[PDB]
Amino acid sequence: SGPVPSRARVYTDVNTHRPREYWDYESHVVEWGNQDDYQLVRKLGRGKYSEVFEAINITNNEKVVVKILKPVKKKKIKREIKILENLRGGPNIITLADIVKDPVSRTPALVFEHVNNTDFKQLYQTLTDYDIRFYMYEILKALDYCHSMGIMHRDVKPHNVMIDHEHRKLRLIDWGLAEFYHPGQEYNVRVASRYFKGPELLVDYQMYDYSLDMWSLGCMLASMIFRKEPFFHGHDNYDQLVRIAKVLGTEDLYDYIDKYNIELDPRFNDILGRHSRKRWERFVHSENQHLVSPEALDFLDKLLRYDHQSRLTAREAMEHPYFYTVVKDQA
Numbered sequence: 525s526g527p528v529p530s531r532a533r534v535y536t537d538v539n540t541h542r543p544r545e546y547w548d549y550e551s552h553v554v555e556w557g558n559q560d561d562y563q564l565v566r567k568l569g570r571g572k573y574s575e576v577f578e579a580i581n582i583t584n585n586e587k588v589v590v591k592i593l594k595p596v597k598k599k600k601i602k603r604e605i606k607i608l609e610n611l612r613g614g615p616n617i618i619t620l621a622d623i624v625k626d627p628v629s630r631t632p633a634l635v636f637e638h639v640n641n642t643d644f645k646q647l648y649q650t651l652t653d654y655d656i657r658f659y660m661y662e663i664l665k666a667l668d669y670c671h672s673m674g675i676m677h678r679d680v681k682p683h684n685v686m687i688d689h690e691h692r693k694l695r696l697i698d699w700g701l702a703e704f705y706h707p708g709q710e711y712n713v714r715v716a717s718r719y720f721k722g723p724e725l726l727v728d729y730q731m732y733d734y735s736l737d738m739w740s741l742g743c744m745l746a747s748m749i750f751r752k753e754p755f756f757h758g759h760d761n762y763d764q765l766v767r768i769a770k771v772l773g774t775e776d777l778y779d780y781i782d783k784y785n786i787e788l789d790p791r792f793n794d795i796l797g798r799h800s801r802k803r804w805e806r807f808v809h810s811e812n813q814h815l816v817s818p819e820a821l822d823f824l825d826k827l828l829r830y831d832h833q834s835r836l837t838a839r840e841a842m843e844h845p846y847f848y849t850v851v852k853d854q855a
């Protein structure tokens with residue numbers, strides 16, 4: 525027999541109750557702006573499917589980010605565009621300002637609001653216990669929102685979180701891997717960065733949901749409070765599961781495989797071994813202890829579970845004692 529099906533615990537049928545056009549991105553017709561409104565200033569970087577630049581909108585003198593796409597399936601472009609338009613105005617979601625195409629090259633480019641970001645590989649070592657909780661709460665506003673809107677980001681990692689520390693401003697960016705959740709749908713597990721991949725991606729369980737973003741968010745939190753980046757440091761997708769197993773133990777892993785009747789790749793049988801569930805204290809030391817508290821550890825534990833159904837929802841996470849001070853300070 526095959527795998528046991530699964531449904532999202534919350535926001536299960538949000539897309540089913542929406543008109544077809546909300547999620548049927550394949551039938552989406554793109555609204556194109558004028559390319560001459562933008563002049564590229566400098567290169568910012570690249571991705572698997574793009575080259576990103578800093579630009580100037582000459583009509584209003586505003587600073588923007590231009591994501592010029594490499595060859596990608598029109599439906600994958602429509603998907604990102606649709607999700608971005610659907611999430612517009614949502615708490616801490618990047619704003620899609622425009623969509624332009626080169627008349628000659630025929631290359632599409634997405635125009636985004638600019639975030640004056642402090643690179644995470646410099647900012648994170650300066651963050652206080654309060655800063656981590658404050659910014660963890662801001663990602664949760666973004667995740668609860670996109671989830672409530674029937675969308676999973678599927679690529680939550682430090683690189684996709686743009687923080688302007690001077691203005692305490694956070695934006696969850698790059699929605700190019702995001703999908704619409706539909707009960708019963710089997711998704712592609714070849715998503716996310718190795719270090720942030722949930723156990724469900726590693727064991728090849730396709731009927732995953734929003735809970736996948738909660739794992740990634742746990743990996744982020746673990747790296748921030750322990751100053752251990754990456755927290756689960758796999759050599760490949762097989763070793764990545766071994767790294768999680770060495771912390772969370774093999775017992776709960778085989779219980780998870782049992783529960784959903786998962787066909788495990790024979791390669792795993794000889795590498796997974798037998799490992800006990802570790803206590804979070806073994807990651808605590810004198811240079812990180814000021815960031816670790818019993819609240820942080822209780823919150824972390826409730827995120828980093830093999831069983832996606834047992835992880836906290838973004839809304840449940842926002843109610844954790846870890847955020848009591850942030851919640852009081854926002855009133």
Ligand SMILES: CC(=O)Nc1cc(Nc2cc(NC3CC3)n3ncc(C#N)c3n2)ccc1C
Pocket residue numbers: 568569570571572574576589590591618636637638639640641642686697698699
């Ligand atoms: C565009 C996308 O989705 N990807 C992406 C973005 C960047 N870089 C950045 C950098 C900054 N601000 C830094 C310069 C101070 N901003 N601000 C807003 C966005 C967005 N969206 C953004 N993106 C690099 C590589 C990729 C592949």
